[PDB]
Amino acid sequence: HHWGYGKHNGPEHWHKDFPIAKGERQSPVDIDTHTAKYDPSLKPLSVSYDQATSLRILNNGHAFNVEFDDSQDKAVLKGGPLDGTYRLIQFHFHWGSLDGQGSDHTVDKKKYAAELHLVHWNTKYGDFGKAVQQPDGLAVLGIFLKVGSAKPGLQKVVDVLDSIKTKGKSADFTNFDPRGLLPESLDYWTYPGSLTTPPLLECVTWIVLKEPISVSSEQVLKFRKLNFNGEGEPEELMVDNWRPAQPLKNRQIKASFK
Ligand SMILES: [Zn+2]
C-alpha cells in the first residue's frame, strides 16, 4: 500500500514502488570521518535568512513541515560547494522512539536523537517541481540534534505541535526565524545524494553540519506525541521516521575542515 515507516510499508519495501531506492546516489549515508577528504577549494557557506517569511506548519503524515514563502529570494543558501542561489522552501525533522536513534545520517556509525533538514531549491529552475528533476536542483542542510540542554529557538515549534497532531492538520506559523536552529560553527561534510523519503529523487547536494545542536529531553518528547494517522483513525505515534544508511557506492564525502 502507501509508504510509511511501519513494518509493512517501511524503508525496506520502498523499492517496489520507487525503484530508484536502489540507485547509485541514495541517501542518507554513514559519514566515515577518516575517509572524508578535506577539500580546501570548498568555500564557506553563506546563510542569509534575515528576510525569512514562515507561513505555516503542517503534519503531512510522515513528519511536520514548517513552510516558507519562496516567491522571492528572501531566505537563501549559497557558497559551500554550490553554484547559484538556493531558496529555502521548508524544514522538517527525522526523530526516534528513543534518544539513541532518530537521525537519517550517522557519523562513524553514531546515530543522533534527531536530524533537521532545511530544504532549498535552485533558483535557475524557476520552481521546486522542476528543481527535483535535476542533479543539482536541491541543497539540503542537515543538522544533528543530541539531547542535553533546551534550545530556546525550537520552543515556538514545540508549542504548536498539539494543534497539528494528526495527518492533514495545519496551523498558521508566521514570524519564526530559522536562525535560532543553527549551531555556532558552519563546518560541514558534503556529498551528492537524494531525498530520504519517496520519491527518493537523486537531486540533492547534501550539506551536513559537523556540529550538533542540543535539545532537551522534554522538547524531543513533544515530537514523539504526534501521529502518523489522520483524526479519528487508530493512533500510531509518529516516531522513527528515518531511513537507514545507504551504500556510498562511487561517491566521495568531502570535508570543509580538517
Ligand atoms: Zn528529511
From Swiss-Prot:
Effect of H62G: Impaired activity, not rescued by 4-methylimidazole (4-MI)
Residues annotated as site: Involved in the binding of some activators, including histamine and L-histidine: Q90
Effect after changing P199A: Normal CO(2) hydrase activity, but impaired stability
Consequence of changing V140 to F/Y: Strongly impaired activity
Localization: Cytoplasm; Cell membrane
GO cellular component, one term: myelin sheath
Record flagged with keyword Transcription regulation: no
Result for mutant: G142R: In OPTB3; complete loss of activity
Top-rank taxon: Eukaryota
Protein name: Carbonic anhydrase 2
Source organism phylogeny: Eukaryota, Metazoa, Chordata, Craniata, Vertebrata
